[PDB]
């Protein structure tokens, strides 16, 4: 027969990390594989909907308690909820899951072993290590391209990142959420300065089985028949800056205020804060909505009247909205988003700036009018999306360098 891989995977809990890590575990999982999930109790429920599209045969799910960390609110166990700076102790706390995880994988028959554990690159230093332990392939999953790779990696002062980005290196290869043709000049550039073995796949856009990670908070039939029902077909700009980020009160009057001014019909989806509104205007302003807490983000980018999303740039973003066919406007705030904006702003004039920093405050009145004009397709930066877009959604079907990557990832899974 042709032989197929048992992988045990392990993503890192936060959305830009799992969404597309679940997505790369069903593209494994359709190439035939076997997987096992390991996940905190809190995160169990986003297997559900990946649990319906596969045998209990071939999806398993191993649950182990969220280790429990001072700094870390009780009963959270994903790092969403979170500010992203508090990313340092998730690091702590998960680390503990390395002792649970070798009685499981130790009182395991010697036959059901894994082949592989493609595991996140946050978590590389300790999965590698239960790696070693049974001589089983660590393959570390990253949702950020190779260009922040390449910039990230090559830091003299890492900071805390040092552990796992060196611990990525002496992985077995690398998996990671872009295309070749996207970034040709760094794909090549992580490989051979920052792979001790010389192995990577890209495997992007991973777009998303059937939704996404997880549950939105207005009723995504309730968007859909707002868009349906406005008026031109590339007209609607919709606001979010993803999972992490939350923006302090002076920016949001300011964004509010480009967006009464801009006359555009838009979405705009703002998000909570956890540790331990506008003024006036959602009723002034129709059309119109304002989905507070988590939103449709996939089907609002891919509605026929979408056609600019103004975003902190994430890499997940970039390919949303690029699969999306949408103009990204770009206003980078922490993480991967510069490095996304010297690669997508800068070097492809793919997106257009609109915004300058974590702390910035626009021009009311200019931000209106990148925002009015930013829809219309005759933009020099929606074309060469548009173009990017063309690149890309062929490098996913059959015969593409991504299509190609993970059937040769899934085979080098077993050897
Ligand atoms: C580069 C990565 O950026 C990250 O932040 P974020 O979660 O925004 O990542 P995205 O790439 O935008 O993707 C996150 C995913 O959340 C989705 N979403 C979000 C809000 C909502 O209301 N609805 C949704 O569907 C969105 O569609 C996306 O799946 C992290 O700093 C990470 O460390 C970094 O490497």
Request: with cysteine; net charge negative; hydrophobic share 40%.
């Amino acid at each position: 027969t042709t032989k197929k891989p048992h992988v045990l995977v392990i993503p890192f809990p936060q959305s830009g990390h799992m969404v597309p890590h679940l997505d790369l575990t069903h593209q494994i999982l359709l190439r035939g594989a076997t997987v096992t999930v390991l996940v905190t109790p809190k995160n169990s429920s986003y297997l559900d909907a990946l649990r319906s599209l596969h045998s209990p045969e071939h999806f398993k799910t191993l649950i182990l308690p969220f280790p429990s960390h001072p700094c870390i609110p009780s009963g959270v166990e994903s790092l969403q909820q979170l500010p992203l700076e508090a990313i340092v102790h998730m690091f702590d706390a998960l680390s503990r899951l390395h002792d649970p995880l070798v009685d499981f994988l130790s009182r395991q028959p010697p036959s059901d072993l894994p082949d592989a554990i493609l595991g996140s690159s946050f978590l590389s230093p300790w999965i590698n290590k239960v790696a070693d332990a049974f001589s089983i392939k660590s393959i570390s999953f990253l949702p950020i391209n190779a260009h922040s790779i390449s910039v990230m990696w090559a830091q003299e002062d890492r900071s805390f990142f040092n552990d796992l980005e060196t611990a990525t290196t002496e992985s077995y290869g690398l998996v990671i959420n872009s295309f070749y043709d996207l970034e040709p000049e760094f794909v090549e550039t992580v490989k051979t300065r920052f792979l001790n073995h010389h192995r990577i796949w890209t495997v992007g856009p991973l777009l998303p089985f059937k939704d996404r990670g997880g549950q939105s908070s207005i009723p995504p039939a309730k968007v859909s028949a707002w868009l349906d029902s406005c008026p031109e077909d590339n007209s609607v700009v919709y606001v979010g800056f993803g999972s992490q980020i939350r923006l302090t009160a002076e920016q949001t009057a300011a964004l509010a205020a480009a967006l009464e001014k801009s006359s555009v019909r838009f979405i705009w989806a703002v998000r909570d804060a956890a540790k331990k509104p506008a003024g006036f205007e959602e009723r002034v302003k129709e059309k119109g909505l304002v989905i507070r807490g988590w939103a449709p983000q996939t089907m609002i980018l891919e509605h026929r009247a979408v056609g600019s999303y103004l975003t902190h740039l994430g890499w997940g973003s970039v390919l949303e909205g690029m699969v999306g066919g949408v103009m990204l406007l770009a206003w980078p705030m922490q993480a991967d988003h510069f490095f996304n904006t010297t690669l997508i702003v800068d070097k492809l004039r793919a997106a257009v700036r609109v915004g300058e920093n974590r702390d910035s405050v626009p021009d009311s009145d200019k931000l209106a009018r990148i925002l009015a004009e930013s829809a219309r397709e005759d933009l020099p930066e929606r074309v060469t999306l548009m173009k990017l877009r063309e690149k890309a959604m062929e490098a996913i079907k059959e015969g593409g360098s991504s299509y190609k990557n993970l059937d040769e990832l899934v085979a080098e899974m077993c050897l």
